[PDB]
Amino acid sequence: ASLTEIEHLVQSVCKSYRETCQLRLEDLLRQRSNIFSREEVTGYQRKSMWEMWERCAHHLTEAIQYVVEFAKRLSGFMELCQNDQIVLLKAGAMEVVLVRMCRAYNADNRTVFFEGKYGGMELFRALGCSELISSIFDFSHSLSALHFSEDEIALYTALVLINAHRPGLQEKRKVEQLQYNLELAFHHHLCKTHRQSILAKLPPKGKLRSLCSQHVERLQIFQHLHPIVVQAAFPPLYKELFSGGGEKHKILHRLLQDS
């Protein structure tokens, strides 16, 4: 590529992200004052473990769907073969969500936007995975210190998804070329905005990998406790990406093929 193409890729990636960001940043900031009362927090704690899991699985699925749409709009993604598109999404969609949610996190009071209001870790105690919850909050606390702009999140999450090292890629060279151009765009934008200092503060890939593994592991614990809840009340896309043996569903293939 050349310089004019990279500048175009920067605006292309930032545009695809704005069209699929799920929640605009200003809308998330305007809600920061709206925090669950101590009686509303106790209500969430009084909910059953199985109800909190399906409510969280529903919100995770909604977020993942926007990441799929981000991928389809992402320059060069739909040119890859379908096997590679599915490998990249299965490996990275959750990782993109884990990065995106820092916008919905308030580092001042350590709360996240959940079901119309902001609440802390104590809101999710009924899940029975306090270690995973605190790892999630800590990860959002870390990214919040970086003070990401919307353009930086756009370019970073594009690279989280377009990773030529994902096992199972049939056209590794083709993903490499797309990843190299997206790297150039991200680094060129950081250079122009004088934000190259964030490169050393970005979390290691093994951290996002550890969070996704913690999610699958705690789901397997819950699935053992309430297998019918997962089969009957969890979204099909969620089961395809996280539940064994739930990969039998093909949701993503339909999501990608349409339009």
Which residues contact Na ion (rule: CB under 5 A)? Answer: 102, 105, 144
**Residue 112 lies near ligand 92A (rule: CB under 6 A):** yes
**Residue 71 lies near ligand 92A (rule: CB under 6 A):** no
**Residue 55 lies near ligand 92A (rule: CB under 6 A):** no
SS3 category, 117:
strand
Question: Would you say 31 or 144 has its CB closer to Na ion?
Answer: 144
- Minimal distance, residue 52 CB to ligand 92A, in Å: 8
Question: Would you say 13 or 219 has its CB closer to ligand 92A?
Answer: 219
With CA atoms as reference, report the closest residue to 237 among 63, 72, 70, 49.
63
Tokens 């389809």, residue located: 72
* Angle subtended at Cα 122 by Cα 210 and Cα 104, rounded to the nearest 5 degrees: 65
**Contacts (Cβ under 8 Å, ≥6 apart) of 33:** none
The pattern of x and - marking residues 218 through 247 that bind ligand 92A according to CB under 6 A reads xx----------------------x-----
The pattern of x and - marking residues 138 through 177 that bind ligand 92A according to CB under 6 A reads ----------------------------------------
Question: Would you say 114 or 166 has its CB closer to ligand 92A?
Answer: 114
The full length of the chain comes to 259
User: Can you tell me which of 13, 74, 88, 104 binds ligand 92A, judged by CB under 6 A?
Assistant: 104
The gap from C-alpha 10 to its chain's centroid, in whole angstroms, comes to 20
**Residue 50 lies near ligand 92A (rule: CB under 6 A):** no
- Minimal distance, residue 105 CB to ligand 92A, in Å: 8
Question: Would you say 24 or 253 has its CB closer to ligand 92A?
Answer: 24
The gap from C-alpha 223 to its chain's centroid, in whole angstroms, comes to 22
Query: Which residue type sits at 111?
Result: T
- Minimal distance, residue 160 CB to Na ion, in Å: 17
**Contacts (Cβ under 8 Å, ≥6 apart) of 26:** none
Distance of alpha carbon 113 from alpha carbon 115, whole angstroms: 7
